[PDB]
Design a protein around this ligand. Sequence first.
Ligand SMILES: NC(=O)c1ccc[n+]([C@@H]2O[C@H](COP(=O)([O-])OP(=O)(O)OC[C@H]3O[C@@H](n4cnc5c(N)ncnc54)[C@H](O)[C@@H]3O)[C@@H](O)[C@H]2O)c1
Ligand SMILES: NC(=O)c1ccc[n+]([C@@H]2O[C@H](COP(=O)([O-])OP(=O)(O)OC[C@H]3O[C@@H](n4cnc5c(N)ncnc54)[C@H](O)[C@@H]3O)[C@@H](O)[C@H]2O)c1
Lengths: 336, 336
Amino acid sequence: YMSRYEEITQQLIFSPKTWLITGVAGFIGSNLLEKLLKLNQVVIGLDNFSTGHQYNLDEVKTLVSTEQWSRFCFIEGDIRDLTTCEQVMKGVDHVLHQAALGSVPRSIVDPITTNATNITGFLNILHAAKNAQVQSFTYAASSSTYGDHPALPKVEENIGNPLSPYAVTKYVNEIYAQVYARTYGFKTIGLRYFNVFGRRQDPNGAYAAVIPKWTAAMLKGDDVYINGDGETSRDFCYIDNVIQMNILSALAKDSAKDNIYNVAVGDRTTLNELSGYIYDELNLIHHIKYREFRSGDVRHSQADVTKAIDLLKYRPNIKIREGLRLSMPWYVRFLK
Amino acid sequence: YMSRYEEITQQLIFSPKTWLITGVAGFIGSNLLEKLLKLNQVVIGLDNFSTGHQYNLDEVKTLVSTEQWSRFCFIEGDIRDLTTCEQVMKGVDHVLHQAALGSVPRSIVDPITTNATNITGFLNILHAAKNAQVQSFTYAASSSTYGDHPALPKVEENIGNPLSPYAVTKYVNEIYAQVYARTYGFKTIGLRYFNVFGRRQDPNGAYAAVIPKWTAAMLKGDDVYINGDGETSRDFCYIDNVIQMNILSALAKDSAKDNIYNVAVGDRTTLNELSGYIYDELNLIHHIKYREFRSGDVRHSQADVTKAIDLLKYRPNIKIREGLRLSMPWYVRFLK
Ligand SMILES: NC(=O)c1ccc[n+]([C@@H]2O[C@H](COP(=O)([O-])OP(=O)(O)OC[C@H]3O[C@@H](n4cnc5c(N)ncnc54)[C@H](O)[C@@H]3O)[C@@H](O)[C@H]2O)c1
Ligand SMILES: NC(=O)c1ccc[n+]([C@@H]2O[C@H](COP(=O)([O-])OP(=O)(O)OC[C@H]3O[C@@H](n4cnc5c(N)ncnc54)[C@H](O)[C@@H]3O)[C@@H](O)[C@H]2O)c1
């Protein structure tokens, strides 16, 4: 039971608010959109369809009622444009900022566009939000920000040197957010996501994340690569845990704001064990080679989620194996 | 004797190199331009005249020969435009990046503009320099990167939380520089300036620094305002000391790069002390109210310059009073 999250969602349905979701056409944004519309929220979406897709928005349309869909106002535009950011902020209560160009290797190969998207765009949205006096502001940060810190499991206060331009940009979001609290009284929540997965995570394209990239490949009958020795290990976090955490963050009591939280389940899986869970869930619905470590990649990864548990009453309820089970039917349909 | 510095400057007279100075029309930039043309160097300059001034360049022109000035190629443009950054990098040996919007309070009022210039702009010059494979890259960092850290004197490896949007931007310059070393092998030097003063520092405008602002006010018979009880203290650093450090860093051995250095004297002077020094020096060349502490003002600032002295062979040989003596005639001339 996700007790606190149930209670908060009940408040929202009784007293609905206006939400802004940036990155709404993407993986996490469109999952947020689906749950907020199902709570009868008014939703303002912004996306530029860089890595996001209109098909994600069309899919969410078919999953909600007509009245629910009628409260979604979609704005095609770019967070790099401050005017656009101010326009979409108007009358907004709760900001969920997901728009960014993700991926460590992308940042290495084009630190420039990435900087513009992830620092300039973040600041534009942060500043428009402060000026519009929104009730809350929650933004996607990253476990990449732990960098080379050798400690396991990862604890929020203890971070290392950032190991790529992507790590830098996300860390910069966090420091601007803190400076905003201290200089303006504008209290935010940053969510360090660990390896999120689930429906509508893009499997196509050179930057695909390991779960949908492998899922696709096994469905193709293609080779399943493994960047390095395979002992690299991760806290894979099903999207529903992330949706819980965004919504708990948006309605957090004030003293839980101006804080960073790990967003994950606290477990660890190696590239090598995941391969098998994926085969088994897929193989259940009727259907491997080693190589060089990837550049600027974090070696080993497990979150300590004690802080979200205690301060927000986060209750992660969906673990790697069940998330895969829940996720595979989506991949079959999308790829068939 | 500034002796490694003398050896380096003698060598440059004998073997000119091509330098890029961004912010060339500003206080520190035009002073670098002056030194470099007098050393017969080839200098590419870049400035948008946002806080810099064409009269600064006209002044440098009157101080160097026709043949020296003919080695100055000046481009009016903006570091926020990557193309411009690439163009001015061509043929460049040594980068001295000074272009930025200074001032903590400017950044509080308009964090967006300060971000675009200080982070986007800085990243464009760093990236173009890396791509051009220049010999050296040195950038203007800031003592505001110490933030709330309580150590005093300030030592480079120990820093705190940044306290304004400005401080965020200058800290991010350092982080990007370190990440560029790590990921592309491009090793830079960051110079944490402390309260620099001297000729061509702008006395006009909401954000003038204390030394020129007071100097101008005494020359006009305007009220000199002390923000607080005047026991507040700084490590005021004459320009020539900064010129020295820039040149020592452009020519540093490889082991001294990918390092941050404080640039200052090592001394502390109170606002009360300073107001007396300024008066004394001016009135030798011939011619006060207390109010509220500036809000969110640092109380005491003093640099440990051990690292610069040991690793770069820096000599902080101009202290505050001699610096004021050297600067006062330029203000007298400038304002009469
Ligand atoms: N999925 C994970 O494992 C993970 C891990 C760490 C951090 N994150 C962060 O989570 C957020 C959501 O990521 P996601 O996995 O859903 O990726 P995604 O690529 O699916 O979503 C990003 C969305 O933002 C939009 N966007 C990008 N730049 C934009 C711009 N300039 N203006 C407007 N829209 C823009 C894209 O079109 C896309 O719809 C991002 O900030 C990402 O950095 C995700
Ligand atoms: N003066 C100090 O005590 C001090 C203290 C800490 C750091 N610094 C840093 O030293 C550097 C030089 O500062 P300064 O005191 O000479 O200030 P300044 O304002 O006199 O000089 C900065 C120059 O940069 C130019 N510039 C700004 N934005 C630009 C852009 N986008 N494109 C092209 N040109 C641009 C301005 O027009 C100006 O000529 C800056 O990086 C400043 O932050 C100075």
